[PDB]
């Protein structure tokens, strides 16, 4: 018959093996819980909720002096398989989470090998909670992090460490998560950079507490702006180029004032759709929030800008007077600077036509040198307001683009935490 | 074996978490409570539900749970888990949701002398009354409520948790360093812990965790504030573009489409709460008032703009108060015979042309002087809106004294 | 203690979950049901479904579970899980998304007479009909029946505690106001069973909605825009810009259509007077836009295809005009030859403007006349609809 | 009390992973009864159905039989259903992953065996959308109960029988049952369904289905949709009637309902099913709207051209000008050289009115087109919906009409 | 009935459910897996996640679980519930958002040779690698890996039932077209212990979108845009609606891409095709804004300010069409603005030109731009 049943009523039912108990000799020493993470894929890094939805598979190893048998003597059974309710398992929560789920998800069977050596790979589905830093969004990379800590027991019980594996006859501990790049597939919109694993002791708080261990691993994840650029940027700044083209248009057209309007309210409608899409957080405006109310900013200068010059174009004569000052800047010096290129009834009703056609005439004169005025002064806002705004666009774009997570995951550290570069 | 196992074994022979600890009969257990606050998650106020990720401290003393270390194998603390000793069941008695008892459910900490210190985490969600006025400029009182459920004030006795040394009793809630991340949107001001009971019922035990956080209104004065204010000075504007231009009528209403889609927006953020209204609301609403009254006196202007001796008298009133008081003080001022009866006909018909358009051009003259007041009238009520509607929300300060 | 170890151990040696507490199976355990209502979550309008945060208090006399105080130190009252004594099927008949039973399962108080005062808290998503016709001045009327599935009167009756449902530790919900709440036990024959009665307690709570939320966020600028259609008839046809305002106002309204069909459920069993107020305003804004369209039409009527017809004429300048008083209304050689004719046909080309000009002044002042009468009959028209479909619900509140 | 003793000798030897069967090859009659008392919503977006029912599920166990004298007359006890064999009648056709009922209520074990399960039910069964006639549409849901475990060749399912007449129909009580006000019960048959390309003894051999024709009451859609949206449309018909000048507003008109009309594809979006079998009939009327629309744009466009066609860029042929008018039918040389230009402005302003007069034909001729296009298009419409009545019979090729 | 009970209670006295149902520890159980997909659920290409409801099916022989059928009256087949057996510990590899092994547990056959038969429902959430190169219009090929998590090859095997899933008893879903399905079995083997091989199934479906949905509600709009934009060019430069058309089309585009935002997923993998179709007709959009800008400027010059040049003149005048003292001041005055008004007709004419030249070119770049985004993705599917 199958010899595994003899063998796993001998370790657990004869040996007594009490499932609420540490696998210690002694009290005062303590269990090694060296663990590993694998990540199966980065399933999405909601940001309105802050919460990262990732699928891994813990991976855990331990020691158990009770789980331990002579192989010769069971007829070479080589290794076991056993439930993790029959077993002591370390119950490694996930701290900071935005559900309850603190525990893995599926629980599957451990494995156990005749030395005592116990590896048990649960899978899980962990939503943790991820204080995203909007400050180059979308042009930006997280800092997202998972923090393993041990509240079943204290650090002077167990001690969580990373989990050693032999390259050259020589032990290199995982400082790393482990993606295998065949069973991974790079997530639409979210892409690893680095991948440090690392384990904290607080000297500050007791050892005797449950806080003075911790093992947290660290996803710096860099967002593909490849559909924020076709969607978003794109669209809005062609359509600020039309806020700048604005300016082009005549004063004689009902349209002057409706195409800024218009411009104003399709940023107004953009900043609608960019309200919805990231954390309501003040710690920083978002580059694509500031950027888009220094752009809106501008086109309502532009709009004011706008009425400026149609007040100016409409002055007729019987309400403004044409100042000597204004008639010397805005008509002579600008331009040049910006290289814009019985009978005696009948005879008294004749000459009451000519000065009336006179006077028609000076006042055309006169509105002729308001509309030129107006356009001086269009031309004028034309070359200060859109090469401000070009510059500053592609200065903000640049400053996105140009926003990487550095080589070193962390700033006072030589190491750089790459599975190609092991060490120690 | 490991002593540990017999250790257990001798102390759960008889052990039964279904009964109180009290050693003699009619005696309180002294339950010690507390929170360490890891992180404040989220704050909906429009279920006004606010969600906290937290460490309940609990210490209570078992007389059962003791045993001399020097007589065992040197064993002076022990693990034991929390669904095999008794429990006083400290639940959140304000929940929104049905979520009453603890989540995590890790191992209590016995000691030798019977000391019980329990810290199981939770994911709680408690209710609070938003205080929908000042919002977003706001602070506010949201506070956990953590008693017995079953036992009362004959059977229990809560009390604050201590510190780390002994001899000192905390009265606020412990924040760990290490582990707090702060919220994007809330800044934790005063967090005090105080037994409140009831003067109607003597048998009522209760610890209050007053959570005084104060919202950083960053976002909301950046996607709404600031667009506000540019489409007031857009209103402003409505009373400076001539009426001859054709477009006051269609910026006035761009900017109140505006202004309406801004409100209808908010209507996803701002409380359901009907028992105040919002200083956002309530400046939405001012300015959505002001530009529908720049429209109404916007379709005045170019109705006296485009009236006509033909169709209009000008009355004499209007005269004296548009034409001679307010220009001062708005700086505002200034065969062959029948070709010569033909001559004189178009000469006469160039007269009386010339005369209506000096009439028309006086109606025009009043409809500009009347714009221009309109322009500094709603510049004045506009800064005086805006400065008194700040002022309100920047005074807005949690009070220094919590009360507790 | 181990007097209280004594006790439960003592207590559920033989004790059976499943059997009725009465000491004859003809008797009938008389239970004192309660309800309490801590907090009002939520009324979801649009699935008829009313969530409350209630504390459902049942009382029973338990024979099996009585004993003698002085035998156990003078023990009078202590806690027992409930999963370990028998309980009733206390279920919510008109449930609705929610859970049917009591599923917390907390402790409760055993007194040593065998009263059992159990108080487990629920979530009762009720299922009430919505009856909308006066949103969002609203007065709804809904329930919660609570009554015993398997069994019926004569095996296991219950009664209200009082007459009223418990208000004391009630926290005040931010937009309805208890107008009035009290609890029936009805006797019914379902027709399953009808030889023998069904019991069951029917808790009506009549809530009352606070209308400011909706009114500052809905109803205002609805009133604004209806304020701003009567409008258009005074802004002169000249600018060619009130069409703009006109389907302006009108996209507004849709917009506010949008976000009004979304708030009240989909039953025709009524039409609520926000959305029959909204039907109004639409219709009126139509109709704006129509007459504003014929009044630009006789605007821009041509006198040379067409002759005012003398009724109007007579009708918008003879009698309009006087009656209205509080209106600015008014009430040798070949060139010498061939220049003389020049004059004379500069001069004919002149008086043929001049007649048409004055036609058409007199269709802009015809029109003009209509834009006034059309003012005061819309601002009329809008401020008495306004008052008859909001001041009935206004003075029937009062 | 009896019945303690009754029951603690009817489960004393039970196990309830058996199927009762007194003998080998021996079927269990399983008989059904639907009570609906709540219709809750039908969701479009998600194809389900969501309903509150009394399943009454009745079968019969030799085991749990006794004899009356023996127990001093009782003829009814009670057992809770955790504790017994059930036939594991499941609803198949569930869209989540709710197989099984939502109370477990106690059984009802009578005196000769026969069993009285009615637990109660949230069931959310799967339903496709009969989109086409969106929203005076006519819905077929239906509910298929079929035992998830056991095969035809051990259960049989059938109906109940209330004096011998078989319940082909779900059972309604006006007692405790409220209308939806949304949905109405034209026809509730039932009816017991066989898979004939299964085998007898394959799990899903046989089934009941419980069908519900609900039609949706249509006044809520066309109060605040339908009327609406047609009021929009009709305004396109006045587009032919403001002016071909510059300060009329064709153009704008006839582009502020489209933009009407795109707020209302925005809004019906929210609403119709994402199913992309076939159009709904409100999206048919939204495109063909939308079609009519920018056909009067297109007109909006000619009309405007040819109504300012100048001279000094187009020519009048006389053919076209004959087409359309008679679609009526249904030192002093200053002077002459002014007198000169005069006559070529007239000229050229009498060319302008005719090209004016012809787009003004052009208007009527369209404008009538138009309006009889929509106005037809509008009642066809609207007639298919309003004809889209139930049929009388539950099913077409059944007589009987399987209402009690 | 009794002789069932007496025959359960038998079968279960020692059974032990955490032992391999083998003869010999050596040995390996033999385990036929198949499939049948019962209704897929819905498609979320944004998450990458495919919800299908199935009823994975495994049949397996455990030498503990059979019995003589003359011995207990007959019986050939009895149900037992799945929490009593030893059940293999099939779990979806790649699993997200949702459940990794059975959770449901329902009961399953057991043949008198120990022919275990059991079909339990389940809802399966893979991550489906979502390929948005040719949407709406798009073709997926996503599997569905099943594997037993602890064990391994010569420990506990796993094969499939047919190469093709079964797919009987599906209900015919309102999005997608079954075109083809099949199933293979790998074998993965490590270097660290080269012997032992590694055993899965792999469940890929070839699904294909049907657009009639995405087509009604989002390229008929699109399609309208589209031609509006061409349509404003006939429209004259003097009645003072020509940007505001252009401006509302803009405007209506904008709201439109608010519902295409939406709808489409937010992949930044691959442009989707009708996102190549949307960025093509809004660029297109702002370029005849930027046109129509450029007309309105030159419709509206003065004279006096720009005098014409002659290449713009050639180009489109000859080209593109082909294919006392006061009577004498006022006649100098009138002939001045006679001239100043044949400049600006000269202008106008120009406008009109180059207006009915961008009307055929945007109605040509619209149909060979549609031509190219749509039609050929319409030619691969054809054929
Ligand atoms: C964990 O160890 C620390 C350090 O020994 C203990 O802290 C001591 O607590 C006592 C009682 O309050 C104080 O008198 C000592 O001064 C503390 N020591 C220090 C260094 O601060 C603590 O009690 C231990 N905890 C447990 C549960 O054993």
Redesign the pocket.
């Known amino acids: 018959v199958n010899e595994e049943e003899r063998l796993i009523n001998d370790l657990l039912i004869v040996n007594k093996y009490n499932k609420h108990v540490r696998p210690v000799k002694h009290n005062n020493e303590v269990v090694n819980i060296a663990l590993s993470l694998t990540l199966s894929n980065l399933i999405s890094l909601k940001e309105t909720d802050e919460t990262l939805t990732s699928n891994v598979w813990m991976d855990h190893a331990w020691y158990d002096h009770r789980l331990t048998w002579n192989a010769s003597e069971y007829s070479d059974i080589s290794i076991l398989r056993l439930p993790p309710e029959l077993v002591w398992i370390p119950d490694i929560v996930l701290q900071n989470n935005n559900d309850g789920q603190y525990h893995v998800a599926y629980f599957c069977n451990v494995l156990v090998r005749p030395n005592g050596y116990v590896t048990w790979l649960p899978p899980a589905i962990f939503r943790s909670s991820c204080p995203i830093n909007v400050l180059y969004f979308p042009f930006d990379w997280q800092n997202c992090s998972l923090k393993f800590t041990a509240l079943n027991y204290d650090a002077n019980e167990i001690t969580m460490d990373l989990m050693t594996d032999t390259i050259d006859g020589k032990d290199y501990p995982i400082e790393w998560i482990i993606i295998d790049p065949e069973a991974f597939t790079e997530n639409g919109e979210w892409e690893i950079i680095h991948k440090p694993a690392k384990k904290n002791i607080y000297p500050d708080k007791?050892?005797?507490?449950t806080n003075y261990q911790d093992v947290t691993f660290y996803l710096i994840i860099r967002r593909k702006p490849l559909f924020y650029v076709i969607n978003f940027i794109t669209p809005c700044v062609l359509i600020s180029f039309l806020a700048s083209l604005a300016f082009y248009l005549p004063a004689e057209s009902g349209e002057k004032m409706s195409t800024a309007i218009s411009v104003l309210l399709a940023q107004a409608v953009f900043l609608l759709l960019t309200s919805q899409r990231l954390p309501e957080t003040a710690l920083a405006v978002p580059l694509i929030g500031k950027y888009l109310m220094f752009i809106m900013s501008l086109v309502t200068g532009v709009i004011v800008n706008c009425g400026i010059v149609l007040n100016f174009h409409f002055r007729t004569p019987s309400t403004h007077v044409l100042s000597t000052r204004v008639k010397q800047i805005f008509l002579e010096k600008l331009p040049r600077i910006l290289h814009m290129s019985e009978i005696k009834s009948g005879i008294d009703s004749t000459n009451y036509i000519v000065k009336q056609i006179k006077e028609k005439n000076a006042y055309d004169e006169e509105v002729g040198n308001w509309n030129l005025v107006g356009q001086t002064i269009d031309r004028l806002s034309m070359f200060i307001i859109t090469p401000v705004m070009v510059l500053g666009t592609i200065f903000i774009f640049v400053m996105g683009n140009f926003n990487h997570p550095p080589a070193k995951p962390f700033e006072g550290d030589p190491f750089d935490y790459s599975s190609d570069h092991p060490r120690c | 074996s490991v002593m540990e196992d017999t250790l257990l074994s001798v102390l759960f022979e008889t052990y039964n978490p279904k009964v109180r600890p009290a050693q003699t009969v009619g005696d309180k257990v002294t339950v010690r409570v507390g929170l360490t606050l890891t992180n404040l998650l989220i704050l909906n106020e429009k279920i006004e539900e606010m969600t906290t990720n937290v460490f309940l401290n609990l210490a209570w003393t078992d007389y059962r749970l003791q045993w001399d270390p020097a007589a065992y194998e040197g064993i002076?603390?022990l693990r034991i888990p929390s669904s095999d000793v008794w429990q006083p069941d400290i639940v959140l008695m304000n929940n929104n949701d049905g979520s009453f008892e603890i989540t995590l459910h890790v191992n209590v900490?016995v000691?030798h002398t019977g000391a019980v210190?329990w810290q199981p985490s939770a994911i709680y969600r408690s209710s609070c009354t938003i205080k929908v006025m000042y919002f977003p400029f706001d602070w506010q009182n949201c506070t956990m409520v953590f008693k017995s459920y079953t036992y009362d004030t004959s059977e229990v006795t809560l009390q604050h948790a201590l510190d780390?040394?002994?001899?000192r009793e905390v009265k606020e809630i412990v924040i760990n360093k290490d582990a707090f991340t702060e919220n994007g949107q809330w800044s934790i001001e005063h967090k005090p812990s105080r037994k409140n009971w009831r003067s109607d019922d003597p048998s009522y035990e209760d610890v209050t965790f007053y959570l005084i956080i104060q919202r950083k209104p960053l976002f909301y004065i950046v996607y709404t504030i600031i667009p506000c204010i540019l489409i007031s000075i857009l209103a402003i504007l409505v009373f400076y573009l001539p009426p001859d231009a054709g477009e006051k009528m269609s910026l006035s209403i761009s900017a109140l489409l505006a202004v309406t889609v801004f409100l209808l927006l908010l209507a996803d953020k701002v409380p359901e709460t009907s028992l105040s209204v919002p200083i956002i609301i309530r400046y939405l609403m001012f300015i959505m008032i002001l530009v529908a009254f720049s429209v109404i006196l916007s379709v005045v202007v170019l109705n006296l703009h485009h009236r006509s001796p033909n169709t209009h008298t000008m009355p004499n009133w209007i005269r004296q108060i548009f034409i001679e008081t307010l220009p001062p003080f708005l700086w505002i001022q200034r065969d062959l015979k029948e070709a010569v009866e033909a001559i004189k006909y178009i000469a006469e018909q160039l007269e009386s042309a010339s005369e209506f358009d000096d009439l028309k051009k006086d109606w025009q003259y009043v409809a500009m002087v009347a714009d221009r007041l309109f322009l500094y009238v709603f510049f004045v009520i506009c800064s005086i809106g805006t400065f008194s509607i700040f002022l309100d929300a920047s005074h807005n300060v949690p009070p220094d004294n919590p009360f507790a | 203690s181990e007097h209280e170890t004594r006790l439960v151990a003592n207590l559920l040696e033989n004790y059976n979950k499943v059997i009725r507490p009465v000491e004859h199976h003809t008797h009938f355990v008389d239970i004192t049901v309660g309800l309490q209502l801590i907090q009002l979550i939520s009324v979801d309008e649009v699935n008829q479904i009313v969530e409350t945060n209630v504390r459902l208090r049942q009382q029973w006399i338990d024979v099996r579970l009585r004993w003698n105080p002085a035998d156990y130190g003078g023990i009078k009252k202590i806690r027992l899980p409930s999963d370990d004594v028998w309980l009733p099927d206390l279920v919510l008949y008109n449930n609705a998304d929610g859970d049917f039973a009591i599923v917390h399962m907390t402790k409760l108080l055993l007194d040593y007479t065998g009263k059992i005062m159990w108080t487990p808290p629920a979530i009762f998503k009720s299922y009430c009909e919505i009856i909308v016709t006066h949103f969002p001045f609203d007065q709804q009327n809904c329930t919660m029946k609570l009554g015993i599935w398997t069994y019926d009167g004569t095996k296991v009756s219950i009664s209200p505690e009082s007459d009223r449902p418990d208000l004391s530790t009630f926290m005040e919900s931010g937009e309805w106001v208890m107008k009035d709440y009290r609890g029936w036990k009805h006797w019914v024959y379902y027709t399953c069973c009808p030889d023998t009665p069904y019991l069951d307690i029917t808790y009506h709570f009549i809530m009352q909605r606070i209308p400011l939320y909706f009114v500052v966020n809905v109803i205002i600028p609805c009133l604004l825009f209806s304020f701003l259609t009567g409008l258009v008839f005074y802004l002169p046809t000249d600018s060619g810009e009130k069409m703009t305002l006109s389907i302006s106002v009108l996209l507004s309204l849709t917009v506010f259509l949008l976000v009004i069909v979304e708030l009240i459920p989909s039953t025709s069993s009524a039409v609520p007077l926000i959305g029959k107020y909204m039907l109004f305003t639409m219709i009126f804004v139509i109709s704006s836009i129509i007459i504003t369209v014929v009044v630009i039409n006789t605007h821009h009527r041509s006198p040379s295809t067409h002759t005012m017809p003398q009724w109007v004429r007579k009708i918008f300048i003879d009698t309009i005009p006087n009656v209205m008083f509080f209106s600015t209304m008014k009430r040798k050689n070949p060139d010498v030859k061939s220049a003389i004719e020049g004059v004379k046909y500069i001069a004919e080309h002149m008086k043929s403007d001049e007649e048409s000009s004055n036609a058409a002044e007199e269709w802009k002042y015809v029109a003009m006349v209509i834009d006034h009468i059309l003012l005061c009959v819309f601002m009329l028209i809008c401020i008495i609809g306004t008052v008859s479909v909001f001041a009935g619900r206004l003075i029937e509140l009062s | 009390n009896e019945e303690g003793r009754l029951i603690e000798k009817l489960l004393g030897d039970y196990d309830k992973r058996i199927i009762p069967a007194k003998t080998l090859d021996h079927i269990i009659d399983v008989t059904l009864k639907l009570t609906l008392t709540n219709l809750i919503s039908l969701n479009e977006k998600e194809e389900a159905l969501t309903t509150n029912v009394w399943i009454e599920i009745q079968w019969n166990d030799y085991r749990l039989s006794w004899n009356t004298s023996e127990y001093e007359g009782i003829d009814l006890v009670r057992i809770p259903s955790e504790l017994l064999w059930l036939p594991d009648v499941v609803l198949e056709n569930n869209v989540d992953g709710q197989f099984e009922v939502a109370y477990y209520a106690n059984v009802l074990v009578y005196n000769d065996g026969s069993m009285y399960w009615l637990p109660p039910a949230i069931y959310r069964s799967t339903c496709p959308i009969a989109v086409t006639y969106f929203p005076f549409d006519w819905q077929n849901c239906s509910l298929v109960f079929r035992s998830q475990t056991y095969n035809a060749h051990e259960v049989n399912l059938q109906l109940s029988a209330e004096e011998g007449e078989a319940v082909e129909w779900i059972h309604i009580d006006p007692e405790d049952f409220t209308e939806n006000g949304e949905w109405t019960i034209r026809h509730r048959p039932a009816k017991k369904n066989y898979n004939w390309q299964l085998t007898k003894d394959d799990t899903d051999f046989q089934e009941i289905i419980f069908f519900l024709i609900i039609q949706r009451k249509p006044l809520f859609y066309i109060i605040n949709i339908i009327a609406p949206c047609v009021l929009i449309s009709s305004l396109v018909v006045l587009v032919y009637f403001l002016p071909a000048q510059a300060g009329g507003q064709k153009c704008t008109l006839s582009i502020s309902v489209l933009l009407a009309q795109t707020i209302f594809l925005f809004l019906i979006a929210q609403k119709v099913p994402e199913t992309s079998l076939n159009v709904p009939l409100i999206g048919k009327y939204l495109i063909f709207v939308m079609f009519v629309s920018m056909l009067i744009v297109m007109n909006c466009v000619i009309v405007l051209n040819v109504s300012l066609r100048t001279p000094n860029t187009h020519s009048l042929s006389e053919k076209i000008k004959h087409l359309f008018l008679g679609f009526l039918p249904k030192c002093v040389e200053a002077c002459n050289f002014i007198a000169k230009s005069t006559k070529e402005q007239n000229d050229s302003g009498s060319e302008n009115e005719n090209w004016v007069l012809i787009g003004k034909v052009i208007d009527k001729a369209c404008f009538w087109i138009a309006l009889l296009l929509f106005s037809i298009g509008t009642l066809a419409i609207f007639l298919t919906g309003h004809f889209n009545q139930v049929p009388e019979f539950p099913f077409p090729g059944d007589p009987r009409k399987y209402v009690p």
Request: aromatic share 8%; glycine share 16%; proline share 8%.
């Open positions: 007791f050892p005797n507490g | 002076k603390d900490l000691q210190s780390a040394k002994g001899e």
